[PDB]
Amino acid sequence: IVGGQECKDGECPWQALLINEENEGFCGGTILSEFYILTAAHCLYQAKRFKVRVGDRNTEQEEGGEAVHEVEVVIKHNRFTKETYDFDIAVLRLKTPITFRMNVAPACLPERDWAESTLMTQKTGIVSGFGRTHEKGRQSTRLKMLEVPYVDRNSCKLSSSFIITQNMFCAGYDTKQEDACQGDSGGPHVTRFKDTYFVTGIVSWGEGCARKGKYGIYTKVTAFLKWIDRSMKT
Amino acid sequence: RKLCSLDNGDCDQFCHEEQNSVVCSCARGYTLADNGKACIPTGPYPCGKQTL
Numbered sequence: 001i002v003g004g005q006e007c008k009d010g011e012c013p014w015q016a017l018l019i020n021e022e023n024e025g026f027c028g029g030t031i032l033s034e035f036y037i038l039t040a041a042h043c044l045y046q047a048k049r050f051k052v053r054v055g056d057r058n059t060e061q062e063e064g065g066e067a068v069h070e071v072e073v074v075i076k077h078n079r080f081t082k083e084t085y086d087f088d089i090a091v092l093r094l095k096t097p098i099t100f101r102m103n104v105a106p107a108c109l110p111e112r113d114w115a116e117s118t119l120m121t122q123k124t125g126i127v128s129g130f131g132r133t134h135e136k137g138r139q140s141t142r143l144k145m146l147e148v149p150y151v152d153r154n155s156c157k158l159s160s161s162f163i164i165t166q167n168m169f170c171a172g173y174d175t176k177q178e179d180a181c182q183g184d185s186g187g188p189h190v191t192r193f194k195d196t197y198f199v200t201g202i203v204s205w206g207e208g209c210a211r212k213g214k215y216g217i218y219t220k221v222t223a224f225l226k227w228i229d230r231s232m233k234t
Numbered sequence: 235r236k237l238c239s240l241d242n243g244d245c246d247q248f249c250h251e252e253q254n255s256v257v258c259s260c261a262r263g264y265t266l267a268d269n270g271k272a273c274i275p276t277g278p279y280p281c282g283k284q285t286l
């Protein structure tokens with residue numbers, strides 16, 4: 001996350017971190033329930049074997065709220081394509097259930113019509129992660145969050161060098177130097193409604209980070225709610 | 235602006251229009267309150283809530 005603020009105690013409890021064989025974070029995820037994590041399909045090609053860490057706000061200290069979970073089943077959308085990042089979504093079923101506590105809680109899955117008419121029409125959403133704090137730097141050891149305005153669909157298509165499909169949406173800023181960045185992929189885009197946070201997007205891709213005339217591109221969760229529901233039942 | 239377009243039909247969470255009237259509902263792990271509008275967490279760590 002470029003710009004934004006540190007997630008303070010309990011503020012981003014649905015954040016999940018995918019960590020490789022060497023215990024380094026490489027992608028984010030969103031806690032959906034005690035057994036399931038939502039992430040980006042493109043993150044699945046970033047490591048051979050991986051685990052999921054929850055409750056971690058600082059990757060340098062061992063507090064006692066952090067827990068590592070092994071993945072039992074990886075459910076990748078069958079239409080995911082490397083070429084365009086269309087269908088950039090996956091659901092992970094964990095081997096053991098997540099214990100909810102301070103800094104560990106699920107985000108809510110909204111109903112489709114209501115999310116489209118009420119959540120995605122809000123001014124802003126919130127993206128979070130342990131990704132780079134600058135386009136060329138290293139991963140953040142602190143969890144960060146950033147308020148990102150929803151971008152007009154016409155504007156986004158005009159700004160982009162690549163196709164923005166109906167499974168994607170844009171958020172962020174035209175020139176203001178704030179955006180998600182490398183390593184934030186797969187993490188949560190949530191929208192607040194009456195002090196309740198609903199999953200609305202998955203951090204997917206961008207033409208660099210916080211570049212002038214460019215926005216962040218997110219997987220449109222509302223297009224996959226039935227898919228997600230089906231994935232969490234088997 | 236009428237029904238669900240009017241301040242979310244006064245619903246805490248999901249709003250639907252059925253037969254010209256508002257019907258509120260809630261996310262999994264919440265129960266609809268007696269007033270049929272508010273959503274009450276069924277147990278600890280309800281989805282979508284910042285912790286403490």
Ligand SMILES: C[C@@H](C(=O)N1CCC(=O)N(C)CC1)N1CC[C@H](NS(=O)(=O)c2ccc3cc(Cl)ccc3c2)C1=O
Nearest residue numbers: 083084085162180181182203204205206207208216217
């Ligand atoms: C265009 C896209 C790319 O090469 N691909 C792969 C193929 C392609 O051409 N597509 C359009 C799909 C995306 N790329 C190029 C660089 C960039 N990588 S990144 O690590 O800086 C990155 C990753 C995720 C991001 C998410 C948000 Cl919301 C904002 C910025 C991000 C920056 C990146 O993602």
Ligand SMILES: [Ca+2]
Nearest residue numbers: 058059061062
């Ligand atoms: Ca820690």
